[PDB]
Design a protein around this ligand. Structure first.
Ligand SMILES: CCCCCCCCCCCCCCCCCC(=O)OC[C@H](COP(=O)([O-])OCC(O)COP(=O)([O-])OC[C@@H](COC(=O)CCCCCCCCCCCCCCCCC)OC(=O)CCCCCCCCCCCCCCCCC)OC(=O)CCCCCCCCCCCCCCCCC
Ligand SMILES: CCCCCCCCCCCCCCCCCC(=O)OC[C@H](COP(=O)([O-])OCC(O)COP(=O)([O-])OC[C@@H](COC(=O)CCCCCCCCCCCCCCCCC)OC(=O)CCCCCCCCCCCCCCCCC)OC(=O)CCCCCCCCCCCCCCCCC
Ligand SMILES: CCCCCCCCCCCCCCCCCC(=O)O[C@@H](COC(=O)CCCCCCCCCCCCCCC)COP(=O)(O)OCC[N+](C)(C)C
Ligand SMILES: CCCCCCCCCCCCCCCCCC(=O)O[C@@H](COC(=O)CCCCCCCCCCCCCCC)COP(=O)(O)OCC[N+](C)(C)C
Ligand SMILES: CCCCCCCCCCCCCCCCCCCC(=O)O[C@H](COC(=O)CCCCCCCCCCCCCC)COP(=O)(O)OCCN
Ligand SMILES: CCCCCCCCCCCCCCCCCCCC(=O)O[C@H](COC(=O)CCCCCCCCCCCCCC)COP(=O)(O)OCCN
Ligand SMILES: CCCCCCCCCCCCCCCCCCCC(=O)O[C@H](COC(=O)CCCCCCCCCCCCCC)COP(=O)(O)OCCN
Lengths: 111, 536, 438, 82, 155, 97, 77, 47
């Protein structure tokens, strides 16, 4: 019911007319399950079940936007500390409103 | 000469794990133990040269392992007195375990791969111990972590074993993340990664907390002890190595190598870990789990002693090296007992005709665990308890921990030997060859030599204490042993249940931390990138 | 340099004259010859010439080509990984598409003109639209995603290049120009934001990798993600430093958010290629942030970590492609017992997964150490944030490994001689870089 | 058999909704004629419009876009009724 | 300090003369300069020839600094390994010099966002000294530790 | 089921293999089979031992070249037999040996 | 083609039947509980951040108070 | 291989190209109606 397809000698021919099923690469293919396939389809196409609810907005804001806000605040604090550490004047960052034009330290200058 | 031992272990690993087809099961059963025996001779030479004769050596294999701008690190080995002692202890225990695995793992399919894992496992421990700079230590640290991952999960068709390996990997990942943070701090403000220029008299608290958080991972302390109990899923030779020397001791070795710890944190954490480990070992009914909780308690003692005095680092290392021996013996004898009885539960063990050597080794290791006078464990534990009297809070908790340790140690001894036979009427047998006898002879020789040579220079130095204070640990251990022999009830059923669940540290993680982790994953993926941001 | 460019032009040229039955053999020989020409370019590149090792111009500002530290590393990496792509791909159509893509990408790396960089890099726009949207195994949605994302980002970059050419009079890197405008800085930045997958512009990469062929995935992960750092070191940092220092808190916000949310999204994956593709996105953020510090450590660490990624992720993608050939499945839940069934494949898979988790004996370790050191030079908290959330990668990698490792399976699915030949160079390069020959 | 997307609604109800687009179709010249004429006159009048702020212009464009009804929408919903 | 256009064009001409003088004789170390081109330009990018030459000079200087720091570390390690338990006293000077070299190498080209590298905790120690002086003279109570004689093996 | 033709090339079940345990004999693993014990194992072990000792000799040369002792040992150490860079021992009092 | 959906009952008598099922609903934590536990654990993760914030605020406040006392001393004197 | 000469020659080529482009960008209206802006241009109208 089966036969060896591969030939190391190089005399390989595919027996498409052979009564016996070749032991080709498809021999070892996984059989698969109907419900697992539908679970895969459901999980990939989870945007179909997306619904805007106040709970969904709450979750998205509190975790994603919350983490962005926390990271931005921490980065701003670190920049302020580094400016105090280095001796630089308060730097004009994009959303900080500063009446100083200091952006890039002059290498030649001693701070 | 100093390099040779690491070469022998890594050669055993490569030979057994890559050419084991040619070598065979017998080929592993020769090349492993022979190579580790040669490494034992080399380690003995190292110990005599460095410790006894005070001759430290530095071997730089190559320079600029990482050379990016100012950041510069080299692969160098410095064998200082701490490193020689840990190297000798590790190689001795690993040679014993390799002798043990020849007969124990014969019924296992991949004995060659197991031997290869064991030898690379020892080699990475020696890389950690002998490194001259922080990066070599990190290399050894991660090597032992990955080797533990590949050894605990050896039985891949068991969901429990692979989940235990995943637990170990994740917890150790968090710990070395904290260590890497401390490493970066120390490079930035000291100029180097080498321990010589690493010295800082004053260090900011953040570095100390990061070092402690990294150390409590491998040296399983509280909130980081979950992996040690689950590490029982692996084969018995793995458990002996991980609990005796390689994994648990590494945190203590790091804390002793760099004295950046804070007295207040280490003492409280260690005493809490010792008490909790003893209490958990009280409830346990597997033979192997009780010994792991005892390992936790001994780690708690060693961590606590750092807070007491300046000699605390020496006392901790002495207890470390003493503990490796009798703990490794306890695991190996427990594993042989499981094989002979085909059982893991203490209830069904009982008196049965056996080998005099194994029963004696179990008895002597348990006596060292208890604190029996004039033994290697006794001195290394009284050095901690007597010197902890100044810290009143630490001393009390350690004395109660000694009571609990005595109780469960005596209970295990009575259940294994004194109790009547509890297993069924079936043909069960494990005949021991001369190789296992050589293994237990090596452990017994280590135990005997520990008495004559000692553990620390200040071991017998006087602690100026009243006699009733100094001899108190013996009385507490004796009372615990007598209560354990009678198998009396110490706690109510509610607290016994609480201790059986190990304090519910894992159930809290399950119900809150893991659920929050996967709800964060749900928000990140389902709601946002495959939700809000996915087209119809 | 000239030999390398000539060979790059020769490879697509040869396909027109080959017999169409000798195409695979000729393509493989041409790829190896281009690799040798790249080695020659390295030989003729003297470190004494510190700014640019080599510069060649062929009659115009657009035809100005040159190699620097970043360019030389990235070009050697692409020339190294191309032959593996060549052997993995069968058919004159596929060979033609992949050769044209590689020629365009490799010419982009050495280009010193922003407009020529744009022209060469986007020439491979339809080729991926056709490649990812191939008849049976491709998805049109993914091709649309990648094509539209690239078009919008590259058009913004093109507008900034036009403004620079109008104001300065030149857009070549070799002519020193500085600008403080934020509109032009954002126009150059948006391309980097999209090409290096950075949240929330990372959605194109996953769909592309899953529905691209294994050779296509190998090229995409290996060098097309690295084109962002060539653009950053060559065309953004020299001119747009004032804007990166002005926006550094925002840059850190976006980079660390990408790292964290990509790590969390990886946890929700059931497809092996998607797991590797999301690991790539989390890995890109450290590179982008380390370069953005504009320090000696950051640039070197970013280029090193790019090399480490371009040696580790192609290997994982290749192994997954081999497993999919053997099993016709990519779902982790279908695949069990791979340790017993495929010991040789499992060993290399575990080795490369350890590499992706940045273990010491792997190049990712050295690269990560350097990048974290640069972040620590900026601030301690910056490094601490990245170091902690690296544990999320361990969780999903360990879960995948545990699911694949054990179970019951009735199929021997282990790699053949051709497959082992395919990954041997990557394993050797990974080891050699891991011991410090970065 | 393969996993497929669920289609909301009944087959005949959806087909009935789609059949409401099959209505007498006017020719587009009638709309185009008026748009051309009023557009020519509109372009003549625009040169005389006052200069508006860019913000107001953008808001007016947004309002016009929101208020614009697609020609198909009127087609489906048109009723020759009071 | 103000630069008129005439002076700017004159410096441009002089830099062209410098480039012509360099072009006359071949030099294999052309991109490894031993001396910079001195200038008073607001932005060095104004004159491209000065920009690239001084950038190459800075690169050479930094490479030298890195190798020098490695040297200093080597003697520090040797001195540590020689004396033994007397290391803290006898290796104070060599550690001092090594840490100074580390700070030079890091701080000269740290970058726009990078902070100063505090090897030996010298800047923190100075800050504590200033704080203690001000608190004592003004009668305030300092919530911070007083300055330390030695905080590391050297500095 | 009639065993396939290639089963003749495959090797038998080893003595250490439990009689009940079944494994697929066609699977190749670099660490070995399920119970190994190949024919000619003794010669392979001898060759492995020879390679181990030769590598030990090379490592010994390398280490001796790179073993630096900058502080004199308190007493005589075994390394003096094979390495000549050992400083002359000085005892705790300070006397040279 | 597809794998069989029929189970094997050979070992049910030895190892028990498969009749008993899980009681889990396979649903996640509630949004309200998740908010509390994120906003509790994440700060614990970021313990260095709060230490740096505390010390920086202490340093700046002490510096400002020194400046104020200096102004007072330099005004009269 | 004189790297200094190659570097300076390449830079000179690029700088010359930039100068040529900026000259090429100087454009007044070429409209036939625009006699004011182009007053100096030589032209003939056949109309
Ligand atoms: C962070 C905080 C948490 C974030 C969520 C918090 C709640 C969000 C509230 C907003 C919301 O509800 O969105 C739903 C809504 C989608 O409606 P729906 O109910 O999902 O279904 C309708 C479709 O039929 C749906 O049919 P569909 O399924 O076929 O379409 C799906 C589509 C639907 O998606 C969209 O339509 C828009 C997607 C981008 C939204 C832009 C940001 C909006 C939220 C940001 C601010 C939130 C703070 C609150 O998704 C996509 O496939 C496109 C995404 C691919 C591009 C990804 C680019 C990402 C950019 C920013 C990502 C958002 C931030 C999260 C991550 C942050 C990373 C830094 O999105 C919007 O309406 C956008 C509102 C804001 C738009 C920005 C302002 C537009 C500027 C107009 C100027 C006017 C010009 C005048 C001239 C006019 C003449 C020309
Ligand atoms: C009595 C005669 C009746 C006519 C009365 C008026 C007579 C004309 C008098 C003067 C005419 C000159 C000025 C009129 C506007 C010029 C248009 C024109 O003449 O073309 C010939 C056109 C017919 O040409 P066609 O080739 O046969 O039709 C092509 C379409 O495919 C047609 O096929 P369709 O209808 O089936 O498909 C429509 C399609 C066609 O597409 C368009 O309509 C394109 C329009 C885009 C804006 C146009 C440029 C705006 C720039 C304005 C400049 C001024 C302000 C400057 C600053 C503004 C900066 C932007 O658009 C849509 O699908 C519906 C959406 C409509 C706007 C789309 C943009 C939405 C943005 C809002 C975002 C918010 C959503 C967020 C949440 C989303 C959740 C995911 O005739 C007209 O449509 C004229 C109707 C007049 C009503 C316009 C109402 C407001 C006008 C000013 C506001 C400007 C906004 C434009 C709104 C839409 C105008 C089409
Ligand atoms: C430090 C300088 C010296 C370096 C020497 C390192 C020591 C040996 C290094 C050999 C290469 C390391 C990577 C080997 C491939 C990784 C995969 C592996 O190790 O094991 C494979 C397969 O093993 C092999 O075939 C090759 C292993 C040969 C020797 C491995 C030694 C241990 C690896 C060292 C750890 C690497 C360190 C990386 C971090 C520093 C899979 O094993 P399991 O998942 O447990 O499943 C096996 C089946 N069973 C369920 C029955 C257990
Ligand atoms: C399917 C696989 C089967 C085959 C398995 C192969 C087994 C491999 C054997 C493992 C090799 C372990 C050797 C590790 C040392 C690395 C070798 C090396 O790097 O060569 C060094 C020379 O150094 C040596 O030779 C080391 C001697 C090796 C033997 C020492 C004792 C062996 C014990 C192993 C402990 C090594 C731990 C090192 C951790 C990093 C090059 O010298 P440099 O000229 O200075 O090169 C510049 C430095 N850099 C590479 C960073 C650019
Ligand atoms: C619609 C979408 C958005 C809706 C939902 C948003 C809800 C989120 C709001 C809370 C977010 C966390 C709190 C951060 C913002 C606090 C308020 C900002 C103001 C601020 O910067 O104060 C600083 C906060 O401390 C800090 O520097 C930050 C401390 C908190 C960060 C650490 C806690 C989480 C750790 C997890 C890791 C994340 C960070 C990784 C780096 C301290 O004031 P100042 O002294 O700096 O002076 C600066 C002068 N205002
Ligand atoms: C003064 C002006 C004021 C502002 C006015 C704004 C007006 C709107 C401007 C929007 C311009 C963005 C253009 C992209 C449109 C989204 C893509 C169209 C959606 C779509 O259905 O495309 C399908 C697939 O596309 C896909 O699968 C691609 C998925 C979405 C692509 C992601 C968008 C690129 C990234 C967005 C931001 C990038 C950085 C921005 C700086 C193919 O449709 P079909 O071929 O079958 O035709 C059948 C017709 N239904
Ligand atoms: C909301 C968070 C910001 C999201 C960005 C996250 C990080 C991106 C940073 C990229 C780094 C370089 C980019 C330069 C600046 C881009 C955005 C910086 C933030 C920003 O919007 O600042 C604005 C200034 O920038 C501007 O005025 C222009 C903004 C960019 C324009 C957007 C589209 C431009 C496309 C142009 C195409 C190429 C054109 C070339 C001619 C307003 O801040 P402010 O200083 O006014 O302070 C007033 C506060 N009270």
């Amino acid at each position: 019911s089966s036969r060896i397809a591969g030939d190391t000698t190089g005399k390989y021919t595919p027996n498409i007319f052979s009564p016996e099923t070749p032991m080709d690469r498809s021999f070892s293919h996984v059989p698969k399950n109907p419900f697992w396939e539908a679970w895969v389809f459901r999980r990939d196409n989870i945007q179909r079940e997306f619904v805007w609810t106040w709970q969904t907005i709450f979750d998205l804001a509190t975790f994603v936007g919350g983490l962005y806000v926390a990271m931005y605040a921490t980065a701003s604090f670190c920049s302020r500390q580094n400016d105090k550490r280095n001796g630089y004047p308060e730097r004009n960052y994009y959303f900080s409103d500063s009446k100083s034009n200091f952006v890039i330290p002059d290498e030649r200058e001693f701070y | 000469m100093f390099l040779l031992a690491v070469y022998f272990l890594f050669f055993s690993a490569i030979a057994n794990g890559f050419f084991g087809r040619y070598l065979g099961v017998r080929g592993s059963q020769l090349l492993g133990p022979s190579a580790l025996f040669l490494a034992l001779l080399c380690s003995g030479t190292i110990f005599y040269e460095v410790c006894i004769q005070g001759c430290s050596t530095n071997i730089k294999l190559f320079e600029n392992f990482v050379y990016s701008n100012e950041l510069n690190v080299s692969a160098s080995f410095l064998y200082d007195p701490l490193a020689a002692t840990m190297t000798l202890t590790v190689v001795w225990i690993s040679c014993a375990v390799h002798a043990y695995q020849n007969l124990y793992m014969r019924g296992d399919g991949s004995q060659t791969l197991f031997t290869s894992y064991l030898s690379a496992f020892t080699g990475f421990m020696l890389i950690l111990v002998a490194g001259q700079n922080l990066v070599m230590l990190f290399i050894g640290w991660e090597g032992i972590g990955v080797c533990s991952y590949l050894l605990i999960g050896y039985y891949g068709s068991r969901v429990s074993a692979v989940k235990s390996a995943n637990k170990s990997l994740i917890v150790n990942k968090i710990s070395d993340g904290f260590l890497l943070g401390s490493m970066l701090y120390l490079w930035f403000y000291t100029g180097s990664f080498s321990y010589c220029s690493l010295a800082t008299f004053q260090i900011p608290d953040v570095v100390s907390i990061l070092v402690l958080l990294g150390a409590i991972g491998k040296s399983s302390q509280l909130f980081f002890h979950v992996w040690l109990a689950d590490a029982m899923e692996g084969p018995t030779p793995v458990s002996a190595l991980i609990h005796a020397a390689t994994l648990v001791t590494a945190g203590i070795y790091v804390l002793c190598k760099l004295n950046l710890h804070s007295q207040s944190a280490v003492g409280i954490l260690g005493a809490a870990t010792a008490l909790m480990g003893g209490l958990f070992g009280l409830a346990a009914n597997d033979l192997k789990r009780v010994i792991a909780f005892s390992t936790c308690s001994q780690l708690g003692y060693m961590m606590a002693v750092l807070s007491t005095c300046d000699d605390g680092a020496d006392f901790a290392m002495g207890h470390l090296v003493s503990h490796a021996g009798f703990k490794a013996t306890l695991f190996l004898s427990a594993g042989l007992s499981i094989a002979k009885e085909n059982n893991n539960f203490l209830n069904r063990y009982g008196s049965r005709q056996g080998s005099p050597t194994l029963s004696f080794a179990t008895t002597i290791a348990s006596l060292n665990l208890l604190g029996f006078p004039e033994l290697g464990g006794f001195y290394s534990k009284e050095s901690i308890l007597n010197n902890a009297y100044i810290n009143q809070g630490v001393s009390i908790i350690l004395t109660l921990a000694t009571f609990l340790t005595a109780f469960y140690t005596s209970k295990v001894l009575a259940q294994l030997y004194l109790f009547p036979y509890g297993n069924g009427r079936q043909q069960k047998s494990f005949d021991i060859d001369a190789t296992t006898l050589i293994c237990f002879g090596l452990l017994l020789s280590e135990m005997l030599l520990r008495i004559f040579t000692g553990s620390s220079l200040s071991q017998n130095m006087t602690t100026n204490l009243p006699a009733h204070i100094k001899n108190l640990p013996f009385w507490v251990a004796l009372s615990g042993a007598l209560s354990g022999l009678a198998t009396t009830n110490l706690f109510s059923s509610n607290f016994m249940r609480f201790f059986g669940n190990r304090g519910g540290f894992d159930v809290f993680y399950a119900r809150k931390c893991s659920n929050v982790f996967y709800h964060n994953a749900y928000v990140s993926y389902t709601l946002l990138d495959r939700g809000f941001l996915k087209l119809y | 340099m000239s030999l390398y460019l000539f060979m790059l032009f020769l490879q697509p040229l040869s396909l027109s004259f080959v017999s169409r039955s000798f195409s695979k053999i000729s393509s493989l020989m041409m790829s190896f010859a281009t690799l040798w020409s790249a080695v020659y370019m390295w030989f003729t590149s003297n470190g004494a010439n510190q700014t640019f090792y080599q510069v060649v111009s062929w009659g115009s500002d657009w035809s100005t080509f040159g190699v620097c530290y970043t360019s030389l590393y990235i070009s050697l990496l692409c020339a190294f990984i191309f032959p593996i792509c060549v052997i993995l791909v069968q058919g004159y159509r596929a060979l033609s598409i992949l050769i044209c893509i590689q020629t365009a990408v490799s010419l982009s790396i050495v280009s010193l003109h922003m407009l020529a960089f744009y022209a060469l890099f986007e020439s491979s726009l339809l080729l991926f639209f056709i490649l990812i949207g191939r008849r049976k195994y491709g998805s049109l949605s993914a091709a649309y995603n990648i094509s539209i994302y690239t078009f919008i980002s590259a058009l913004g970059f093109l507008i900034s290049a036009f403004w620079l050419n109008w104001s300065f009079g030149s857009v070549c890197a070799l002519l020193p120009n500085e600008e403080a405008n934020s509109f032009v800085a954002f126009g150059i930045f948006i391309l980097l934001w999209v090409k290096a997958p950075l949240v929330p512009f990372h959605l194109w990469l996953p769909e592309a990798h899953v529905y691209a062929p294994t050779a296509g995935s190998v090229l995409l992960a290996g060098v097309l993600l690295k084109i962002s750092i060539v653009g950053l070191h060559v065309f953004f940092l020299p001119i747009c430093a004032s804007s990166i220092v002005k926006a550094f808190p925002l840059i850190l916000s976006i980079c660390l958010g990408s790292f964290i949310f990509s790590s969390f999204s990886t946890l929700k994956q059931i497809d092996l290629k998607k797991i590797v593709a999301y690991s790539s996105i989390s890995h890109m953020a450290i590179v982008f942030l380390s370069s953005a510090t504009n320090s000696g450590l950051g640039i070197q660490g970013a280029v090193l970590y790019c090399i480490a990624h371009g040696l580790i992720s192609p290997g994982l993608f290749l192994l997954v492609g081999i497993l999919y050939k053997n099993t016709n499945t990519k779902l982790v839940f279908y695949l069990r017992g791979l340790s017993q069934q495929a010991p040789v494949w499992w060993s290399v898979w575990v080795f490369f997964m350890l590499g992706n988790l940045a273990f010491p004996l792997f190049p990712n370790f050295i690269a990560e150490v350097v990048c974290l050191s640069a972040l620590f030079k900026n601030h301690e908290l910056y490094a601490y944030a990245f170091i902690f959330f690296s544990f999320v990668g361990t969780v999903y990698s360990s879960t995948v490994l545990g699911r694949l490792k054990g179970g019951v399976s009735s199929q021997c699915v282990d790699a053949s001689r051709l497959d082992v030949i395919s990954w041997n160079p990557l394993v050797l390069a990974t080891v050699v870089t891991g011991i410090g020959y970065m | 058999d393969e996993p497929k997307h669920q289609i909301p609604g009944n087959a005949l109800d959806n087909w009935a909704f789609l059949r409401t687009y099959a209505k007498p179709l006017p020719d587009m010249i009638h709309y185009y004629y008026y748009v051309y004429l009023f557009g020519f006159f509109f372009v003549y009048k625009v040169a005389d419009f006052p200069e508006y702020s860019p913000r107001v212009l953008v808001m007016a464009a947004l309002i016009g876009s929101l208020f614009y009804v697609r020609r198909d929408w009127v087609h489906r919903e048109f009723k020759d009724s009071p | 300090t103000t630069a008129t256009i005439e002076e700017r064009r004159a410096f441009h001409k002089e830099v062209l003369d410098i480039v012509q003088s360099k072009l006359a004789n071949k030099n294999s170390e052309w991109a490894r300069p031993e001396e910079p081109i001195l200038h008073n330009l607001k932005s060095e990018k104004e004159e491209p020839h000065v920009y690239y030459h001084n950038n190459n000079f800075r690169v050479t200087r930094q490479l030298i600094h890195f190798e020098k720091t490695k040297i200093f570390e080597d003697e520090l390690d040797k001195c540590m390994r020689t004396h033994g338990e007397a290391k803290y006293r006898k290796c104070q000077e060599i550690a001092k010099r090594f840490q100074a070299s580390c700070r030079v190498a890091s701080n000269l080209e740290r970058g726009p966002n990078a902070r100063k590298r505090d090897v030996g905790f010298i800047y923190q120690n100075n800050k504590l000294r200033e704080l203690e002086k001000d608190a004592k003279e003004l009668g305030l109570n300092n919530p911070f530790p007083p300055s330390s004689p030695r905080t590391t093996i050297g500095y | 089921v009639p065993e396939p033709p290639y089963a003749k090339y495959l090797a038998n079940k080893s003595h250490y293999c439990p009689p009940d345990f079944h494994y697929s004999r066609e699977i190749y693993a670099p660490y070995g089979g399920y119970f190994n014990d190949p024919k000619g194992w003794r010669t392979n072990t001898a060759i492995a031992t020879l390679v181990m000792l030769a590598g030990a000799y090379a490592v010994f040369c390398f280490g001796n070249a790179r073993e630096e002792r900058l502080r004199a040992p308190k007493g005589w150490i075994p390394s003096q037999l094979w390495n000549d860079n050992v400083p002359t021992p000085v005892d705790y009092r300070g006397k040279v040996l | 083609n597809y794998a069989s959906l029929k189970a094997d009952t050979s070992m049910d008598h030895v190892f028990g039947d498969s009749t008993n099922k899980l009681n889990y609903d396979f649903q996640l934590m509630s949004s309200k509980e998740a908010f509390f536990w994120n906003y509790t654990l994440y700060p614990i993760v970021g313990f260095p951040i709060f230490l740096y914030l505390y010390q920086f605020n202490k340093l700046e406040n002490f510096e400002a108070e020194i400046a104020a006392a200096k102004a007072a001393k330099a005004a009269s004197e | 291989v004189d790297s200094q000469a190659e570097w300076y020659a390449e830079y000179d080529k690029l700088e010359k190209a930039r100068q040529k482009r900026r000259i090429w960008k100087w454009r007044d209206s070429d409209s036939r109606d625009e006699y004011a802006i182009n007053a100096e241009e030589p032209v003939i109208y056949i109309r």
